[PDB]
Ligand binder design. Sequence first.
Ligand SMILES: Nc1ncnc2c1ncn2[C@@H]1O[C@H](COP(=O)(O)OP(=O)(O)O)[C@@H](O)[C@H]1O
Ligand SMILES: Nc1ncnc2c1ncn2[C@@H]1O[C@H](COP(=O)(O)OP(=O)(O)O)[C@@H](O)[C@H]1O
Ligand SMILES: Nc1ncnc2c1ncn2[C@@H]1O[C@H](COP(=O)(O)OP(=O)(O)O)[C@@H](O)[C@H]1O
Ligand SMILES: Nc1ncnc2c1ncn2[C@@H]1O[C@H](COP(=O)(O)OP(=O)(O)O)[C@@H](O)[C@H]1O
Lengths: 257, 257, 120, 257
Amino acid sequence: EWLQAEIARLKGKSIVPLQQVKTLHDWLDGKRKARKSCRVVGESRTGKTVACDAYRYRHKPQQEAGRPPTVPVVYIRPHQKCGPKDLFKKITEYLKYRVTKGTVSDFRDRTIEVLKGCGVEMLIIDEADRLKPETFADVRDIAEDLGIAVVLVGTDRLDAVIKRDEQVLERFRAHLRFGKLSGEDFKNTVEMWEQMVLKLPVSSNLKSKEMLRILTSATEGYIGRLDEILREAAIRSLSRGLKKIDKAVLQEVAKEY
Amino acid sequence: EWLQAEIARLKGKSIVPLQQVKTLHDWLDGKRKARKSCRVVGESRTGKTVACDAYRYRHKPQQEAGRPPTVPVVYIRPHQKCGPKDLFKKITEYLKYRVTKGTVSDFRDRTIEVLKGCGVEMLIIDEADRLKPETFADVRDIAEDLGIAVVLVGTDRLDAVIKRDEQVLERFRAHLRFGKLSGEDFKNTVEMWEQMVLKLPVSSNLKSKEMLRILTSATEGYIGRLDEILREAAIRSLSRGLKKIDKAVLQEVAKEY
Amino acid sequence: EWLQAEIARLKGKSIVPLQQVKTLHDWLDGKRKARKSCRVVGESRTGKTVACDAYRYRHKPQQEAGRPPTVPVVYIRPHQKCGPKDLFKKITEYLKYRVTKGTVSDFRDRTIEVLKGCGV
Amino acid sequence: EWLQAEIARLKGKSIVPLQQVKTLHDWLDGKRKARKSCRVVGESRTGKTVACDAYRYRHKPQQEAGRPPTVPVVYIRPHQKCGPKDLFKKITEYLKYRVTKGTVSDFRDRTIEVLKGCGVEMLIIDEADRLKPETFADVRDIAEDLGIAVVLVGTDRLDAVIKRDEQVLERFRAHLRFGKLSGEDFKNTVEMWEQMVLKLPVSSNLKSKEMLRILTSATEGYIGRLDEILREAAIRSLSRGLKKIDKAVLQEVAKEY
DNA sequence: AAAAAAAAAAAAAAAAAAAAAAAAAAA
DNA sequence: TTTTTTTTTTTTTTTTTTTTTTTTTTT
Ligand SMILES: Nc1ncnc2c1ncn2[C@@H]1O[C@H](COP(=O)(O)OP(=O)(O)O)[C@@H](O)[C@H]1O
Ligand SMILES: Nc1ncnc2c1ncn2[C@@H]1O[C@H](COP(=O)(O)OP(=O)(O)O)[C@@H](O)[C@H]1O
Ligand SMILES: Nc1ncnc2c1ncn2[C@@H]1O[C@H](COP(=O)(O)OP(=O)(O)O)[C@@H](O)[C@H]1O
Ligand SMILES: Nc1ncnc2c1ncn2[C@@H]1O[C@H](COP(=O)(O)OP(=O)(O)O)[C@@H](O)[C@H]1O
């Protein structure tokens, strides 16, 4: 069944180029060449993790000689209430280096060693709100001991937590802020996203004022909502024998959430 | 590329002789001759750590005999929540010795042994606030047992840390303060920074009011912010093919950082 | 005094180039390029230790780049009845790395990692 | 340099199919289907290690199912004086499962769990002659509690340890010899060797009376001994400029080793 | 009414001894 | 062989701080 193949294909995830993504990539590349630490602030379901992650694929570490890998960008997602030891362990795990059983001071020394051996000019920390207040001192300690840029990606809680300590705030003053979709930006994004993700036999008439209206009402500018809504509508539309997404199907999916 | 060589020179660190650095150096020489302990208190981005390093560099340990080399000055920066054993390890790692597996009492003894063997006319400890209270007791123990002076570099909170212990208040009464740059001092230094650090082929006249307002407003009298801004502005200007920093280039960095 | 200077010089150390040393050095370069193990056999007070020590200085480590140093030749002198743990300690300390505490297996893993990092 | 490229090729490692290797592979497949433990005894420098490794390469991990890797064959190389903890830990790490730090009882249970989750039809221990006698009992316990066939790859030292326990000798009765080459087998192997490893613009005529006599005197039926000889003679000849191995060069190489 | 001072409950991090068993060694 | 002798290897009791939550008080 061809429909089965399309269902399986849609149930996946794909990357669709966007302007804000390119802006973030260029800004972060500038910071990486300057070795200047910074932070990034945005709302949930805006796709900032996808931008931080898509950037790292381009700069994947490649080593041809017998010497160990030289990695320029390392990327870790801390768990809830991640402490100092837990964070160091993740840095070591990402570099495919054997964790040494021992104490926290041993973890600190080992982390400095593995980071000194490789490049690791830029470190992208996601979900920085979850980071425990005790650990930020270690983060900036690393940023000062070695010339490595540190990027703290978080929401408004990141702002709130950072502004409580003077040194951390001084270290991470420069920043980039994400926005939401609206107007022509939103319409162009919907058109581009459907052309990039949907290969349905017939057009969905997305440009129509009414479809844009209901998608705006259900989306509110959050790409993390538009992607899910349109993918579910597509799977359901194809499942009922409709090659294209239809107005009633859109209304149904929007009503469920 | 020649521009890349100039940029690499701008990225590298250097030290400019300044009024505050010389003041601290003369004070420290007096204290070590008196063998008296004291404190150094200042704000962030004031360059007091750099001044300590510049002091250490002048007193090079020269051995003119077969007997072990003698170190007159020791410098340590403890890690977060440094305990007694960690500090003793730092002392014995700074000096060219090793410590075998053993107890805290053994570490105390080995540290005292190498401290007696070495000269250690003065001991400088950065970031005093991080030290644990028991570690403070041990620092005082060393200062009282051996003819060695102890300098506790600290921020505004150093007084608060030492207010919970009457004994350190009794022995560390003398103190020196670091301040900020304002008025004529800031302007004089700025001219010196343009001529002594930057590789700018053509002078940009930073002391002029048009370019003074920007530097002064963003910097707020902190040395670190100023040097950061100037190095970055020079790098950006040379990358653009300029032999002199333009007004727009100087203004962009301030807002970005 | 002239005499004291000459006497102090005489009581020091010096090296006389010999055909034995050059022979050893050519042979060792061959073995190093071929990555083959071998033996050096000789009586005491013949200075074979000095010849090997001199071989070491010809190929010095390069740390011009920011990366860890890549010393191609390591030279150690085990003490009497040296156990395996202590041999690993010698290797790790020579290359200027911290020796993690633990069992002989931990030292073994640490030493292999360091030996892969450097040229050796 | 083209010559250096050919030399780099000659300094590499290749694999050549021999009847000895195919015999071992068929025998091992039989034992794995039968789920019966056994052992292989063969002299040093025979290449049995390489034959077992090639066998492992024949059956790659089967991730075709959605949840676990389902690797049917594992292969571990114990270190000298391998204890039970190190053995269990190597087995665990080979299956990409984290080590649950604890006591040897925890390692035992964890290893059993990961061996049950994966297929693990057969387990191969390379150079088992340095496996501690305490741990052979653990190996037998694994072979009994789980439907796993265990193959021991060791030489003459295996049996002098196995015969120290009545229980272990019953498990590994099926034995296969793995010895040297001689006569027509040796001559055929040499010609195959001269064709596969010495892609050479000029035949060295190794399949001849005197060349075979030299190689036999130096080789004594050991392929491992022969490897260095032939590869190194080819490299030396090509470095000097000779397109093939002259008899004098071969004799010189043999004298060196 | 609505901010400011007060008893349980979880959770994380670190040496310092002691015993036993095995393996190698020396006359 | 008898004993020594060490050498690992593996298996075991005390000390301290930090949140959160909640209930009474006062103002
Ligand atoms: N550039 C993009 N291309 C395609 N889908 C995207 C993109 N950015 C976000 N998405 C969708 O949004 C989700 C990712 O958003 P998320 O990483 O949760 O945002 P954040 O982590 O910044 O809160 C994914 O499920 C994906 O489908
Ligand atoms: N005398 C100096 N010469 C050059 N640069 C200086 C000097 N003093 C401070 N700086 C700048 O300030 C930074 C050092 O500040 P820092 O080490 O944080 O001192 P502190 O710990 O006292 O704040 C350096 O990056 C350096 O560029
Ligand atoms: N090539 C040499 N030139 C000068 N003196 C030498 C040379 N080789 C050895 N010696 C002398 O011999 C001593 C070193 O010999 P040593 O290294 O003990 O030999 P081995 O260790 O092989 O017994 C030194 O004290 C040195 O004076
Ligand atoms: N079938 C083969 N193909 C290629 N090389 C082989 C083969 N058999 C043996 N060799 C050579 O012999 C060596 C393998 O010997 P090894 O695995 O050490 O035997 P063991 O460890 O059983 O003594 C390798 O260096 C390899 O070059």
